[PDB]
Each structure stands twice: as C-alpha cells, then as structure tokens.
Amino acid sequence: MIVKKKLAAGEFAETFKNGNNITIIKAVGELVLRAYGADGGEGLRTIVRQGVSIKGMNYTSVMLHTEYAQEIEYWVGDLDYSFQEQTTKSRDVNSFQIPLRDGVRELLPEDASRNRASIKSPVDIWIGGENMTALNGIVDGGRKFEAGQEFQINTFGSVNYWVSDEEI
C-alpha cells in the first residue's frame, strides 16, 4: 500500500487497520531530521534521516516523532518485495536539426528512450519546462543559452524553447 505522511509541527499518528505490509520491505521517504516508531503489539522507536529500505516488523499503527516541523511530505510504500534499478546506458546516437520557429514551442518531446541531448542554437534561446510562457516577448519560467553555446539536457520529458515572436 502506498500511503501519505505529511508535516506541521507535532506528532502524527496514521493508524490504518491492516499491517499486510508487516513482514515487508518499506520504501520509506525521509527529509532533514525526524524520529519514528513501530506499534504492532510492542511500542518501538526509530530514527532515520535519509531515504532507506527497511525490513519487516509488526505494525498496527505508526509513531511519528518530530524535531523539525518544516520538513516535507513522503510516501512510505511498504511492499512484500520492492526492487527498482535502471539508469540506461545509451546504445544509439542520432544527429539532426530542429526548425526553430516563433513563440513557445516544444524542443524535445517526452521520450522514455532519451538519455541525453547535446544542443547548439545559432541564436540566443530560452529553455524551460511546461511552465515556460512568453506573453509579449518576455519569457517567464525559462533561462537563456547563448547563440553558439553548446549545452546539454539529460531528461526524458518535454522541453520547451523560445527564440522569437515573429510569424514570418
């Protein structure tokens, strides 16, 4: 089960009535500095400050001790067997030219297969994510790369560009 854990200041107690994920690997997420506990017959403690893979114990309720009130929400997905490993490697290179046109347009599409792009624009180019806009020739949510500057993007998601607002 994939379950939320939010913050505010004090102790939190999320007690969902079913520890099916007792003898189970926890994919627990963790920020800055906290303490937690295991309640499943016995009242136990836990202290952990980095994203870690936990083993199985008994659980009916979760204890959530707090030192820093202003850390960030997590999803402690407890599952029987949880293994996630994959970065690649890139086999193929493909070289081509994009058509830079007017307004905010997509430079690269979401493409699960892309690892890496090395890009050079012959004109100053503004690059950003899905938030980038250029109402009135003023780019928001972008940053400039200079004409002739080689740069890289290593995502597999959309990127957007802006170079000009001229239709012809």
Partner: protein
Amino acid sequence: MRSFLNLNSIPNVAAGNSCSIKLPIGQTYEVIDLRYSGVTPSQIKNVRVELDGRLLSTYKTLNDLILENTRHKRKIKAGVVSFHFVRPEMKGVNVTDLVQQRMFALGTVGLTTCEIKFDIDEAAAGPKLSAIAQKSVGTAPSWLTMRRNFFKQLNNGTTEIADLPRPVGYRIAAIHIKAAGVDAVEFQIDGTKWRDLLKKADNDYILEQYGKAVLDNTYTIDFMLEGDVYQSVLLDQMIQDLRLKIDSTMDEQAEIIVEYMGVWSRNGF
C-alpha cells in the same frame, strides 16, 4: 546481608556516544545508583532497561527517572540518580511491607543479559558516569515494574484515550499524562467510572494527601496511593473498555506514561 558494589567502569562515556550498563547475572539488584557529571539528566536520552534483549522499562531522558523518584518523595541528590527496583512505598496486606517492597527487586537468575542502555547527547559538556549496585541474593526476574511510553494528541476540549495496551494478567500502578493544559481527567473500565471527572486541583490534593509530590505539567492517576498492590488496575482478560477522558485547554501532543506490573516473561509484555 546486602552487598554494595562499585559496578565496573561504563565503557566509552562521551558526548554523542551510545553507552550501556551491562549488569552481571546471578544476583538481585534492589537499587542502582548512577552518578553523573559533565552532562544533564535531560542529556541522557533513550534510557532502556533490557532483560535478555527485550524492553522492560523506558525513559525518554534520565530526567524522567528523577521525576519518578521525586513523585514518591524519595531522596533526591544532585549528581546522582537511582533506579529503584524495590518499591519502598509498598505496603503489605497479607504479607509484610518488606516482602511487598522487595518483591519488585530486579532478580537476574535465569537471565542471559541484563542491560541499561542510553544515549549521551552531543551537547554534553564532558560526560562522566559511574554506577553502584545495592544487591541481594539471586532471584528470578519475577514481579517487575514496566514503565512504558505513549504519545497521543490532546485537543482543546475533550480527548479520549482507549487504545492503551492491556497485557493479560498484568496490572497498572499509575498513569501519568504529561501535558501543560490538562484541566480534568476521568478514568473508566467497562463503563464503570473508577475516577470521576476530577479537577486537577482536586486530583493533586489527593496525591499530596498520600505523601506524593505533584509533578509539573503532569496529571497523575495513582492506583496505588495506599501502597497496596491490590489497589492497582488488574488487566482482566475480560475487560472490554479501558478509557481515559481528558479535558484539556490546549491542543498539544501528550506523553502518556503507564507503569505496568507483572511477572516478567521471556516472551511476555
């Protein structure tokens, strides 16, 4: 005849260190005097008494042990804190007072390990800790006090706590609600109101009436005010509801301390 021993030196006593007081098995520990310096009781965190690797009693900080002793009006001295296994306030009903008090001593016979673990805060100036043991003839762990920690949210209005562990055959000597805005509390078992919604001032008056000291920001429900163990809550395997109705004025997280009691078992509470 009792034996007073200067326990072996505590290994690696330093700031930010995790130390332990490993007790030699064979005899009975009635009291353990822990001398400290270069560190505050509050700087000695996560104090756990373990028998055979299992948890018996727990203290968030050593200061809670100081308050535990203060409540019973036991001798308090700066630079020293004692672990009173034998309960001096006990009074016998069908046995002598001495028997009722010594019955809580920490026997180690049949044990594989007896430890008192704790963590030294990083801010500790120059921690220095030593221990002395007041022992007697060996006995099984038997009847022991099991201090348990629980954290629950209190509201400004009325909060109810009915999810307290009810180990069968065990008893409850007292319950300590650590909160700053508790006005009154009510205790009931199976609908029966054993403790009416008593105002703090009224509850605290009864406590003092029995030679106890009222702890700051704490609402104590002493079930052994007379020293009679039979007055404590017997966790009957038939109790359907063990409830606590807390009337607070603040919205905070309270630390509920429950002093359990029972014959120690290798596979028990």
